[PDB]
Amino acid sequence: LELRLKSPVGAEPAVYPWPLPVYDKHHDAAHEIIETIRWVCEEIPDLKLAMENYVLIDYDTKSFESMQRLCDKYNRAIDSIHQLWKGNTRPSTGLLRHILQQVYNHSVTDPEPFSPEVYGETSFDLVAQMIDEIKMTDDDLFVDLGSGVGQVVLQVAAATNCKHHYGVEKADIPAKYAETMDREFRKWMKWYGKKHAEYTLERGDFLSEEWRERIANTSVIFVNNFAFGPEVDHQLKERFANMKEGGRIVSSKPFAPLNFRINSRNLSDIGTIMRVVELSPLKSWTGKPVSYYLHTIDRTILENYFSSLKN
Ligand SMILES: CNc1ccnc(Nc2ccc3cc(C)n(-c4ccccc4Oc4ccccc4)c3c2)n1
């Protein structure tokens, strides 16, 4: 009828119905259960000692009795550790990738580059590099513009100490799935006993009047602008022009040339008020040769040009 996994921190058990749900072609619920057990064993060294070696080696994902025996063995090992303990940190990057996968599989049940379906395999590591590079503190406010199902926001919230993390998505289908992703993330994080910063996944148009002041007051913007049209790009540069000095924008395509040279003919260009650098994990990376672009609000670019003319 069903499979149960006791939480290492005494939260409510994870309940899986049998037959287990079928995920996408290269993910399955049975291996999710097994990997969940292996991750909890890493978190708790005593759990490995309490558990008999054969349990995680010899199993049959296609047998209810076999899958039930595995869950029973883990649950009894958890109970022994809970007895031993009688007598809340940020998740590790490896655990976080697994949590995000689990959160996705439990949220998206119904049927092109960097698809949410393959986030863990093609996006996670690049996002993890960007988090390591773009140093964020408790004074920062993070916003992912066009956040989709909310994976980037969840990864950043589980990794940094920003005051708040926001995801804004306009499309009906991703924004609705993000509601489930949000609930599933909070639930699974509690189950493992892991800490995450505050975040909000919301439906809205980042080009709206409400969002103008919100963009102006954001210190760190992430924006996958790869598929943006020239009008969306033009309107976004106008929003960025209201940001504070030192405000940062991390994007998949640059908003200004990397080599911008201020002159009399290009004074209205966004390049007059922002520094732009191309960052790459390749500069021990072994994934895709993909770059990200860091823009920093700096009005001294414009100031020095005027001072140069007057002096
Ligand atoms: C990828 N999907 C989502 C979903 C929701 N939210 C965001 N946010 C977000 C914001 C800023 C950037 C900068 C980079 C490099 N990535 C990026 C990261 C991982 C993989 C690819 C990336 O970018 C692309 C995308 C397409 C083509 C080429 C590169 C960004 C992602 N991304």
Side-chain angles (χ1 to χ4, degrees), residues 1-21 23-24 26-51 53-61 63-64 66-68 70-72 74-87 89-109 111 113-172 174-175 177-260 262-282 285-310:
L1 181 102
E2 63 171 41
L3 295 179
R4 291 171 167 264
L5 292 179
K6 284 201 159 193
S7 157
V9 295
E12 282 303 292
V15 180
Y16 296 84
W18 184 278
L20 299 164
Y23 299 160
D24 61 88
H26 320 287
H27 295 96
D28 95 321
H31 288 143
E32 175 196 305
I33 292 169
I34 291 149
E35 287 165 32
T36 300
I37 294 159
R38 301 221 259 262
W39 283 112
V40 184
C41 288
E42 282 311 301
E43 289 303 312
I44 316 159
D46 286 318
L47 205 64
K48 267 174 179 161
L49 302 163
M51 269 186 98
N53 306 325
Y54 77 90
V55 179
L56 287 147
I57 291 156
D58 312 317
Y59 57 82
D60 181 12
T61 66
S63 165
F64 174 72
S66 170
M67 287 300 89
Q68 189 179 44
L70 165 74
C71 291
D72 166 57
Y74 159 80
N75 285 343
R76 303 299 65 79
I78 280 286
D79 286 350
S80 302
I81 263 63
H82 286 175
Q83 290 301 328
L84 186 67
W85 292 354
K86 282 183 172 138
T89 64
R90 275 176 282 186
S92 71
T93 304
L95 175 61
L96 180 56
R97 185 211 309 283
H98 168 78
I99 295 173
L100 296 179
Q101 188 56 62
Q102 192 159 39
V103 166
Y104 183 85
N105 297 140
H106 289 263
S107 305
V108 185
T109 57
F114 310 97
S115 153
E117 201 178 73
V118 287
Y119 187 86
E121 293 78 28
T122 62
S123 300
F124 186 91
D125 290 334
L126 181 53
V127 176
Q129 287 284 300
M130 300 188 274
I131 293 166
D132 289 349
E133 181 74 16
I134 316 307
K135 270 75 77 189
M136 282 178 251
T137 71
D138 57 5
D139 308 305
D140 288 304
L141 285 171
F142 174 87
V143 177
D144 188 28
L145 297 178
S147 60
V149 303
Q151 293 158 313
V152 170
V153 176
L154 301 178
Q155 189 174 346
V156 181
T160 84
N161 34 76
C162 291
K163 209 177 178 185
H164 214 95
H165 303 81
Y166 301 91
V168 58
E169 181 50 56
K170 192 182 80 174
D172 185 60
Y177 273 136
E179 288 176 34
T180 306
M181 294 281 291
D182 173 33
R183 288 190 287 269
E184 286 287 338
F185 181 76
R186 292 177 193 272
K187 179 203 81 176
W188 281 107
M189 289 289 275
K190 281 190 214 104
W191 193 93
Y192 289 101
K194 299 293 157 181
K195 176 190 179 192
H196 62 81
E198 271 314 296
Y199 70 88
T200 303
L201 293 182
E202 46 180 289
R203 193 176 203 254
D205 191 339
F206 61 72
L207 298 180
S208 78
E209 283 310 296
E210 183 217 350
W211 270 93
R212 287 191 116 96
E213 201 47 38
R214 299 187 65 180
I215 285 157
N217 299 332
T218 302
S219 61
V220 180
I221 285 163
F222 270 33
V223 54
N224 173 18
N225 63 320
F226 184 80
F228 291 2
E231 227 280 319
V232 173
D233 169 78
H234 169 78
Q235 290 301 329
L236 217 34
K237 289 170 181 184
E238 190 170 310
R239 304 313 186 274
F240 302 154
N242 295 317
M243 291 170 70
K244 296 172 171 76
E245 295 316 316
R248 287 169 298 166
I249 309 129
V250 184
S251 68
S252 50
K253 282 171 108 165
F255 283 100
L258 306 169
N259 56 293
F260 187 81
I262 193 164
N263 63 55
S264 65
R265 291 84 58 197
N266 61 15
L267 280 176
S268 57
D269 296 4
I270 198 66
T272 63
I273 61 150
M274 60 170 56
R275 305 281 173 176
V276 196
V277 64
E278 175 184 83
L279 303 165
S280 187
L282 272 172
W285 186 254
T286 67
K288 286 200 180 304
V290 173
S291 284
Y292 53 105
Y293 301 81
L294 170 67
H295 313 73
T296 312
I297 303 302
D298 182 12
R299 290 177 181 94
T300 71
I301 295 157
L302 189 58
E303 221 292 325
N304 303 344
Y305 172 82
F306 274 93
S307 301
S308 91
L309 285 190
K310 302 179 271 191

